[PDB]
Enzyme design. Sequence first.
Site, mmCIF file in Angstrom:
data_model
loop_
_atom_site.group_PDB
_atom_site.id
_atom_site.type_symbol
_atom_site.label_atom_id
_atom_site.label_comp_id
_atom_site.label_asym_id
_atom_site.label_seq_id
_atom_site.Cartn_x
_atom_site.Cartn_y
_atom_site.Cartn_z
ATOM 1 N N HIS A 15 38.103 84.056 31.450
ATOM 2 C CA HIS A 15 37.332 83.826 30.227
ATOM 3 C C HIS A 15 35.975 83.126 30.363
ATOM 4 O O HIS A 15 35.234 83.036 29.386
ATOM 5 C CB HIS A 15 38.186 83.044 29.222
ATOM 6 C CG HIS A 15 39.285 83.851 28.609
ATOM 7 N ND1 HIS A 15 39.084 84.683 27.528
ATOM 8 C CD2 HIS A 15 40.588 83.988 28.952
ATOM 9 C CE1 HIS A 15 40.217 85.297 27.232
ATOM 10 N NE2 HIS A 15 41.144 84.893 28.082
ATOM 11 N N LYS A 21 31.007 77.891 15.575
ATOM 12 C CA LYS A 21 31.712 78.055 16.843
ATOM 13 C C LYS A 21 31.848 76.635 17.383
ATOM 14 O O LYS A 21 31.227 75.712 16.852
ATOM 15 C CB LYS A 21 30.865 78.889 17.802
ATOM 16 C CG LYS A 21 29.526 78.234 18.118
ATOM 17 C CD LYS A 21 28.376 79.228 18.133
ATOM 18 C CE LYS A 21 28.536 80.288 19.200
ATOM 19 N NZ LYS A 21 28.632 81.664 18.632
ATOM 20 N N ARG A 22 32.648 76.451 18.427
ATOM 21 C CA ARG A 22 32.824 75.121 19.000
ATOM 22 C C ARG A 22 31.483 74.546 19.472
ATOM 23 O O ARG A 22 30.615 75.285 19.948
ATOM 24 C CB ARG A 22 33.815 75.181 20.168
ATOM 25 C CG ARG A 22 35.259 75.354 19.722
ATOM 26 C CD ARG A 22 35.722 74.151 18.907
ATOM 27 N NE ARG A 22 35.804 72.928 19.711
ATOM 28 C CZ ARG A 22 36.896 72.519 20.355
ATOM 29 N NH1 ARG A 22 38.020 73.221 20.283
ATOM 30 N NH2 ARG A 22 36.870 71.393 21.063
ATOM 31 N N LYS A 80 26.287 76.787 24.153
ATOM 32 C CA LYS A 80 26.185 77.548 22.901
ATOM 33 C C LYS A 80 24.790 77.346 22.296
ATOM 34 O O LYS A 80 24.317 78.166 21.507
ATOM 35 C CB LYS A 80 27.227 77.071 21.883
ATOM 36 C CG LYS A 80 28.669 77.032 22.371
ATOM 37 C CD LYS A 80 29.344 78.379 22.286
ATOM 38 C CE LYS A 80 30.864 78.238 22.417
ATOM 39 N NZ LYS A 80 31.532 79.563 22.298
ATOM 40 N N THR A 112 33.416 86.289 20.322
ATOM 41 C CA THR A 112 34.150 87.147 19.396
ATOM 42 C C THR A 112 33.633 86.902 17.987
ATOM 43 O O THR A 112 33.712 87.781 17.118
ATOM 44 C CB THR A 112 35.671 86.901 19.440
ATOM 45 O OG1 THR A 112 35.941 85.504 19.309
ATOM 46 C CG2 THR A 112 36.246 87.424 20.737
ATOM 47 N N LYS A 157 32.832 89.433 14.518
ATOM 48 C CA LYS A 157 33.277 89.208 13.145
ATOM 49 C C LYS A 157 32.101 89.325 12.172
ATOM 50 O O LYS A 157 32.232 89.919 11.096
ATOM 51 C CB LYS A 157 33.918 87.821 13.025
ATOM 52 C CG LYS A 157 35.082 87.615 13.983
ATOM 53 C CD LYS A 157 35.577 86.175 13.975
ATOM 54 C CE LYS A 157 36.592 85.959 15.088
ATOM 55 N NZ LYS A 157 36.819 84.526 15.163
HETATM 56 C C1 LIG Z 1 36.301 83.845 16.216
HETATM 57 C C2 LIG Z 1 36.487 82.268 16.307
HETATM 58 C C3 LIG Z 1 35.952 81.520 17.360
HETATM 59 C C4 LIG Z 1 35.149 82.166 18.519
HETATM 60 O O1 LIG Z 1 33.792 82.185 18.078
HETATM 61 P P1 LIG Z 1 32.596 82.412 19.155
HETATM 62 O O2 LIG Z 1 31.367 82.284 18.347
HETATM 63 O O3 LIG Z 1 32.831 83.652 19.953
HETATM 64 O O4 LIG Z 1 32.733 81.180 20.129
HETATM 65 C C5 LIG Z 1 36.055 80.156 17.351
HETATM 66 N N1 LIG Z 1 36.691 79.510 16.332
HETATM 67 C C6 LIG Z 1 37.244 80.215 15.307
HETATM 68 C C7 LIG Z 1 37.937 79.451 14.174
HETATM 69 C C8 LIG Z 1 37.150 81.594 15.282
HETATM 70 O O5 LIG Z 1 37.699 82.288 14.230
#
Ligand SMILES: *Cc1c(COP(=O)(O)O)cnc(C)c1O
Lengths: 810, 810
Positions: free
Chosen positions: B350, B541-542, B547, B649, B653
Amino acid sequence: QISVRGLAGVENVTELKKNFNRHLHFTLVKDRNVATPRDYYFALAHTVRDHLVGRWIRTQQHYYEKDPKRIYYLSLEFYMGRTLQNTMVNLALENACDEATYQLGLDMEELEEIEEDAGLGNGGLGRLAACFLDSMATLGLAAYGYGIRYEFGIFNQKICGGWQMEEADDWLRYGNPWEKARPEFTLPVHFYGRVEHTSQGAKWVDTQVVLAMPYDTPVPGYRNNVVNTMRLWSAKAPNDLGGYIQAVLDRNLAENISRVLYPNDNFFEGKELRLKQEYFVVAATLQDIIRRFKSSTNFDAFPDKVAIQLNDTHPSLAIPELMRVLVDLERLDWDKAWEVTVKTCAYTNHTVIPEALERWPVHLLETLLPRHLQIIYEINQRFLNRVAAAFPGDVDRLRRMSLVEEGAVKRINMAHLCIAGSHAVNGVARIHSEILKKTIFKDFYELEPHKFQNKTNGITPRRWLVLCNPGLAEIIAERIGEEYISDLDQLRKLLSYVDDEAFIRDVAKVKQENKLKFAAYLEREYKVHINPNSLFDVQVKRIHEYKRQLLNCLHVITLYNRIKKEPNKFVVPRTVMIGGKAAPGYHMAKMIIKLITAIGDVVNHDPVVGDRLRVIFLENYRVSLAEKVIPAADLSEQISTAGTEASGTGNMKFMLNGALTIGTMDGANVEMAEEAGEENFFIFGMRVEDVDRLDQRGYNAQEYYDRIPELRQIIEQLSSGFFSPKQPDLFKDIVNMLMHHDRFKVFADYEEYVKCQERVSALYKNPREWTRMVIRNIATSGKFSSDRTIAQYAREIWGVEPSRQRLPAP
Amino acid sequence: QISVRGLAGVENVTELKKNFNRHLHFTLVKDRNVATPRDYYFALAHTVRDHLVGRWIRTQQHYYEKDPKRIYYLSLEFYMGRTLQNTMVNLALENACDEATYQLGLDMEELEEIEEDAGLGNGGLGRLAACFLDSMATLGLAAYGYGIRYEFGIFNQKICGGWQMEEADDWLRYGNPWEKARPEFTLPVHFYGRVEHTSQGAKWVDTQVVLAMPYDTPVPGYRNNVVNTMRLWSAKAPNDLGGYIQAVLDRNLAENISRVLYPNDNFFEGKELRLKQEYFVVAATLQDIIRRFKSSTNFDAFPDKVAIQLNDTHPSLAIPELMRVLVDLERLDWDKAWEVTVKTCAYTNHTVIPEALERWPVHLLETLLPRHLQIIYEINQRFLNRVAAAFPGDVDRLRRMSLVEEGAVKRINMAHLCIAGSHAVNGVARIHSEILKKTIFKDFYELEPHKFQNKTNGITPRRWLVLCNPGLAEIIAERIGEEYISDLDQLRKLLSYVDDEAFIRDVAKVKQENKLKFAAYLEREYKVHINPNSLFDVQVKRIHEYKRQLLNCLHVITLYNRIKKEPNKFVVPRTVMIGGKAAPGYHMAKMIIKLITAIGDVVNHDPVVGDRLRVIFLENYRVSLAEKVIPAADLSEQISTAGTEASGTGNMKFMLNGALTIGTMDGANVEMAEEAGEENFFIFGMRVEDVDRLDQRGYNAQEYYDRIPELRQIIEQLSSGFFSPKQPDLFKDIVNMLMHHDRFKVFADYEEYVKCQERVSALYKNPREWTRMVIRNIATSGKFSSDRTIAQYAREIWGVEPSRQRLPAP
Ligand SMILES: *Cc1c(COP(=O)(O)O)cnc(C)c1O
Ligand SMILES: *Cc1c(COP(=O)(O)O)cnc(C)c1O
């Protein structure tokens, strides 16, 4: 099958089977092909539980509308045992469920054995709370049992190498279908902190907070559609936490409060965790009570709508906690708050044994509950001013009655606090209550004679007769109907059948069937070898020196020696059964268990003895085991030293189930003999007065050892290693205790006990007369129903009238 | 109401209401007069759950009879979120339940908000496991998710004084209606001990035992009647225990294993507790797999009936554990056992970030898992012999490929162990997989090229479209039907509607309604003030330096400064939303959150700015919040430094929900731009090649600071205390990092990023063209369905064929 088990109607059975399959499918998520006996037990439990909910909801709604005076029974122990059969009995569903499961191709009795005992108690005190809940529901009182939901109850006892081994009682492992978590009613409990004195009142600040989450369990009355509640609190840490991970893991520090039940029976251990448990239950319960009170602000009517019964001193902090809330939070003046507190609380004493008395060190309360200590000091001061006024100049009385005990370390006598803050104090048997007034509480009785009462203990005839002895309940019902089940005094009508040849034969038949049944169980589980034709001599209760399991041991050894002396002489065959758990830290009690098994190792394998004498130690004695062995007993051993067993309840269970009693004039034994007639009881030994005379003179065990040859032989066998070949001095501590520091005078009652036992064997040789004496006992056991006990508490202490009226259906 | 939500038939609704009232009464033991919204939520959940059991039971029975190859997805994280709505969607019960509750006088949407998120994950990796479970069920694969039932998931985030505060995620407080405890399937797990070498094989003895209790949760496929299982293990201490009380309390030492999820996202922390969690899940799962295998002894067929997928290296111990069981317990020869192990296991990587790589100290494995260490050493030795044979004399390659890492302290590279013991290793996006072969795993690729594959990540269109954006799913279904929900490539048919005035208007209408809806939620909860007419610029995102939330911050400050410079100049209104949690011990990430709130404190209260610019930090970002904000977004920020985000991911979305994307050519962004066309994406910044060139030369932030006036102003504002008046040097660590040790070259992409953002604002001013570009994105997002991802894993790694066949009804 049997009448007293209700009807098994076409519609009912069909409905039961349907719901059984529904739960197996939807609730347990299983199908007939992978389901195990445990899965079947749970499907049945959920099915029976369903029948309880409707009544439970409307009973509570009923109390909300009629708003009667509420009774709150505070106890740190509720020795409930299993719930399935008891629920079926009280709902008249036993035969229906038996038929329904029969048609589904299942054996209900096999399924009932799967349920885990709810062992949230140690013995007498905890089981009394359980019987009481049953009787209060049966008598239609708006009662609530409040306690702690320990995730680990009394430890399961294993016997290894003849020694007791303890293992965690993980009773919730597979889940508890009877309880209902009520997280929405969670309440905060405070600990530690400090007291701040502000312009208008004192404040308890900077405290540590632990949440109390309640779990409700239904308590059904006997066929009256009443379902009361037992609310047990569980400890939960608040969410507001190397820094992160550790903080989360440390939550268990707070949740440890409701983790485990202290296994001490009639023995005080001043550990901080125990103190926290006691305040936890008190603080949460009192907020719940007050909340409910304000719903349907004068607190003058509080005593008219609330009654708090303290089971022993364990929940004694309720007194200062109630004062704290009324004075600190509600802002009532002291005198007003005190009047309300006294009228609301009542205290029940369970023992006079000094080592069992709760005396908490001041430094502990000082750190954990700083505000409560201040309140206790204020209570003590105003109380002593009252004593000084009534007995001017009597300075020794002042120090004797003080709630604060001086000495090495200052301690708070919780018993004194309970008497000062309760409008009623009761003993649990006539002799016990008299002893309280004449000795340990003499000073208090002289100051406030009106507070002292007696409320002789009792047991519920539902669990202790109908449930565990259906065969006996049936033959009784055949002659006098079923009314006695909720009105035990009717058993007196059985007195007119004492000469009835048919009855005599049936009573004896039921006992024989129970013995064969138990004898089988001993074989099926544990692989033993008892003989059903022998006299079943049993002593089951917690292991304690005052209970005198040792006196029994001496008799057993005496019997064995007499046989070895004259091998071909006839003797009535006996199976001596002794059972009970010993507190983990009680060395002598643990040695007594080893002695019993050791005696069995010798006696049970001696060819000359044969099947004339067997000594078996009943492993893991608990409520469900009691339900099995008691109905099978011929002789009940209640041999505590006179004046030490406050009441006893096991004695009552044996009496109701057809066993004759050999015992001392102690506790309720006195009242049982009085009810049945002394000629129908096997009484022996010193009376309380005799024990006092001996203490005046000074007890010298050596005297008995020197004048009784048979006793001397026994002691020499123990000393020489006769019962412990590989370890000759294994029982040195036992002999030393018996010879030099026996607080319970085992030797003093030895001779009379042995002679009495001879009279027992003599009667057993005459089946007809033995059975006739048994009928006289069963017929006069009515007074010992907890329904009688509860009716007295209701009328003489709580100020409420019991009711036998059926609630408006389900 | 809307088509895609199924039918609300007369019979169905009536049945639902009936069962809702049944559960409220019998299950929750409540009546309409005392029930709260939470009680209503649970009644609905139990009602929906019921519809799932029948299918669940027959799906499992089906696998038992047809005995297909099983897929076991091992992960320490399963970021599930809520389960109620998802279950209704997959069972086509949404409209029926909406109507049923409507008639009962309840608002289903209000009830859905009561459910607690099952937050057993940190972010990307954990949510992928969740989407995967959904797709495997939808594709009819006999799959099982195996993980840990943490009683505390990812911490709930609170913002106090602009700082992140963490509080325990007690998600099980009110109970979990979806899980089913299976205590009957409990398994023992061993720790510590030592290895004994006997005549025939090695033995692992004197170990500490911890029990693994499984809890099963159903995983429904989309309208195909398939219900798979997610089995989560819970730690339980065995019952075989000052001596007594303490022993009972110490049980929590063993139960702490499943107490809490480690909150580190893409960062390795070598703590013993974490290692125990990793072995716990592996040991219990492997016994369960083997047990199931032996039911329906050659292990040669094991790989034909079993596939184990390792989600990252967290469950890497499965490799040596499988060898241990086959060699030590089953007694297979090493070579045979190894062949089986390799063919059974597959590994998914990952990230390439060094600090995220698991390298366990040898002394830790030595103490905790002595036998596994020996096995790992043996594996390493035979592997290196293979390397030495293929690359004779290349001694540096030997040390580079070794599973054992020399240095200060010896460590085991778990990634190397996974490659050696797996028949397949895959990256999660084309660019990422290429980077693995070209850099960090270059040596391994050269030795075994056949093992390396790519499997681009994907998301489930059920939760990420139908569930969270019904309005959009409906207008799409109106034109092309409902088939696309389980065959997302059909969205390409939407390309023929790009010039359709009706569609353009509907797409824009749905977005506007989502924004108003979210804008309301922000007000209703948290009381904010956003303007629905502005462009919703979001980055959720985290929080991580790679990032680049900081790059975004720099743009925000740039926008604010430009406005202050020319106040009466027109600018497209924006609402910049940034959300995400920071690991408790990640200082810089915590400082970034404070910076964001601080910027908001200045920008949101400046009169000159007005409603032209708002900066909001989205508190407690989690799955349920993602479902709300993503459908409301106009612009998706995916701005990681090229080569650091393996896939991402969240980007997918946003694309499926009508937001345009501004991002770097990193991870899946490259493939998204490729699918939609670069002219329909807002690409900017350095490419991976550009980053390498900069590293060769040496990155000097000062250069950018000296040549870009606007950037210099921002840095000087941060330094001078412009954003922290009371604490002038509050952000000194941030500036120092940006200026002297920025591993992610924030300054290097600043200029291109700002210019790109200008092109975004330009397009937004032309509603029609913005919407047309949006349609081009949605229409080409089909490749990113996890159904596509899973079909590839099935065919190219597991060797099984996916199926869309409905299972024989419920
Ligand atoms: C989809 C998702 C992530 C991953 O988001 P990225 O922007 O790819 O890091 C992280 N947290 C939650 C709650 C998500 O639904
Ligand atoms: C009734 C009972 C007791 C009390 O027995 P006594 O002989 O009065 O001490 C103790 N334990 C259990 C399990 C009981 O049922």
